[PDB]
Design a protein around this nucleic acid. Structure first.
Ligand SMILES: Nc1ccn([C@H]2C[C@H](O)[C@@H](COP(=O)(O)OP(=O)(O)OP(=O)(O)O)O2)c(=O)n1
Length: 577
DNA sequence: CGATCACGTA
DNA sequence: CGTACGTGATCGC
């Protein structure tokens, strides 16, 4: 039972309401609002957006901090309203972020999935209402209005049970003081966007398109035949059938043609080096040149990513359209992609600051390993120091390969990769890899104690927690399937590390945003990617930012070891190196 | 169309 | 058998 309102009335502008501002397009930037539902103490209302968003009282109610709203995925509504010059304020409860903190593994992506967690089923999933894929469409107003009111009614009914469970888990402050404030900060960053020099991307593309055409012609002469190099199965016929190259690894479909297999086949035939070079070049061309160009808004000539705040099981942010968290850096040919990201105003610069080894520093603090804490208190090179300890040699005697192997051990912790995966990584035997690990644990007995304890804790409690009380349930921790149990064990070890690092970065983002406003700076957060924050600011602000941003990031939390931030600035993202 | 699969980037 | 997102091909439709 609901009012399909033709006009905004005062009873819809109570100071506590469940609100639904429906944006059905997946990319909500500059996207239509198809309807509005308000549920409060006085009733349930469906409003047409062409009515409500033109009503000054409704817009003023939207923007009034003291008018508390409860929503699901408020960031989608806030950004969509920003593109119409309308501020959304006073969102005191976000059901999507509540459900994500309670159990990230549920994959809660609509109101109905969140409602299921509390045995509430009087709302349909969005997919049942809008369809999927090709058939996706907005239904007519009677069907649309009911779905929106039911979602608002669900939000109305579910706020108190979700808050009760958050408080029981000691996660109420995590929602109210971290994730929800962060959601506003991410909305501003998405709306601001990042300026892209499309002409530089296009000139790189023409460069790649000439080099690809050369390598591809080379590959056809070496195969003595033309074929689709991008088809792994065709390429596998060329390599393993016509060229009789040894089959070192088989996928479930057929033969593996991954980069790491191909580098071991390089000595046998000159086609291999060229296939590798075609793969790196075509990855840049298809994924990063034509990929980025496709999502530059031609009106703003910016990219406006969407940060997914309620996706990963560790608490890390994710980002899409474009994904800027996998923009090339390691290889120089690909690193130059970052030259395409420029300040959005003349006389501004890009400022990037990044945590140095935040994960291992979190580990040192969590495990209280005296050796690992001393290494960071001395600001050592952690890979060199780990090589010194593992191999029981002095700093003068650490070769590059010893350092590369200690580095692989350290990354095998930061990422929770398997005992087996270290062997694959170092290309060694597993008994070699596992003996590396035992020497590491003899050099770092606190890390070992931590790994044993956190696994036991995960089995005993059913989950692990981060510094700021995020949790990840690990039901596969009791599995009799060894491969399944091991992963759960590795996630027991890895999640308090990666997730605590994610907590710290999020807190830094909140602390920075407040400091920037306190300092009356024009600098704006643009991007968070792994352990890095990227800003743009006037040329005139670089010196103050050189002191402010690292200070804020280093003080976000206090651990038993210091946090270290590196920072640079330049006329492009690439140059902020 | 759409879903599976193999590849790769961070 | 790390956290992801995106591209291409293939194959059923
Ligand atoms: N799973 C991974 C692997 C590597 N990086 C690092 C490598 C780059 O230096 C940087 C690029 O952004 O992120 C990351 O963030 N996440």
């Amino acid at each position: 039972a609901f009012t399909l309102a033709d006009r905004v009335t005062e009873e819809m502008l109570a100071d506590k309401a469940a609100l639904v501002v429906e944006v059905v397009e997946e990319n909500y930037h500059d996207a239509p609002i198809v309807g509005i539902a308000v549920v409060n103490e006085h009733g349930r209302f469906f409003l047409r957006p062409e009515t409500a968003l033109a009503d000054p009282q409704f817009v003023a109610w939207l923007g009034d901090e003291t008018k508390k709203k409860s929503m699901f995925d408020s960031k989608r509504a806030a950004v969509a309203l920003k593109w119409k010059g309308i501020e959304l304020c006073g969102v005191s409860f976000d059901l999507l972020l509540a459900a994500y903190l309670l159990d990230p593994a549920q994959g809660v992506d609509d109101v109905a999935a969140a409602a299921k967690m509390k045995q509430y089923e009087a709302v349909r999933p969005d997919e049942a209402v809008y369809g999927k894929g090709a058939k996706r469409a907005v239904p007519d107003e009677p069907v649309l209005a009911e779905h929106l009111v039911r979602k608002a009614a669900a939000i109305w009914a579910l706020e108190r049970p979700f808050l009760d469970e958050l408080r029981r888990n000691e996660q109420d402050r995590l929602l109210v003081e971290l994730e929800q404030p962060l959601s506003s900060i991410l909305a501003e960053m998405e709306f601001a966007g990042v300026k892209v020099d499309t002409k530089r991307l296009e000139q790189m593309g023409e460069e790649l398109a000439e080099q690809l055409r050369t390598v591809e012609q080379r590959i056809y002469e070496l195969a003595g035949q033309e074929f689709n190099i991008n088809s792994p199965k065709q390429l596998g016929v060329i390599l393993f059938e016509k060229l009789q190259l040894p089959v070192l690894k088989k996928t479930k479909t057929g033969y593996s043609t991954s980069a790491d297999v191909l580098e071991k086949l390089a000595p046998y035939h000159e086609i291999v080096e060229n296939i590798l070079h075609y793969r790196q070049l075509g990855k840049l061309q298809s994924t990063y040149i034509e990929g980025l160009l496709k999502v530059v808004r031609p009106d703003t000539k910016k990219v406006h990513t969407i940060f997914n705040q309620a996706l990963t099981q560790t608490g890390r942010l994710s980002s899409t359209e474009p994904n800027l968290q996998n923009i090339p850096i390691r290889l120089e040919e690909g690193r130059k992609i970052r030259q395409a990201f420029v300040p959005s105003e003349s006389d501004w610069l890009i400022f990037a600051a990044d945590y140095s080894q935040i994960e291992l520093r979190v580990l040192a603090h969590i495990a209280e390993d005296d050796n690992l804490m001393e290494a960071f208190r001395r600001d050592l090179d952690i890979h060199t120091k780990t090589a010194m300890d593992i191999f029981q040699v002095s700093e003068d005697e650490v070769t590059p390969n010893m350092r590369r192997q200690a580095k692989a051990v350290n990354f095998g912790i930061v990422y929770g990769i398997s005992d087996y995966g270290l062997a694959q990584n170092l290309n060694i035997s597993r008994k070699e890899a596992a003996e590396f690990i035992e020497r590491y644990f003899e050099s770092f007995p606190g890390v070992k104690r931590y790994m044993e304890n956190i696994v036991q804790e995960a089995k005993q409690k059913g989950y692990v927690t981060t510094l700021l009380h995020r949790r990840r349930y690990l039901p596969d921790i009791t599995s009799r399937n060894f491969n399944v149990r091991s992963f759960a064990e590795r996630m027991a070890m890895n999640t308090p590390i990666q997730g605590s690092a994610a907590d710290i970065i999020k807190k830094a983002m909140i602390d920075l945003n407040a400091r920037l406003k306190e300092e009356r700076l024009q600098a704006r957060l643009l991007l968070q990617v792994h352990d890095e924050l990227i800003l743009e600011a006037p040329k005139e602000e670089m010196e103050r930012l050189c002191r402010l941003v690292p200070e804020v990031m280093e003080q976000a939390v206090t651990l038993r070891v210091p946090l270290k931030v590196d920072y640079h600035y330049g006329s492009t993202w690439y140059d902020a190196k």
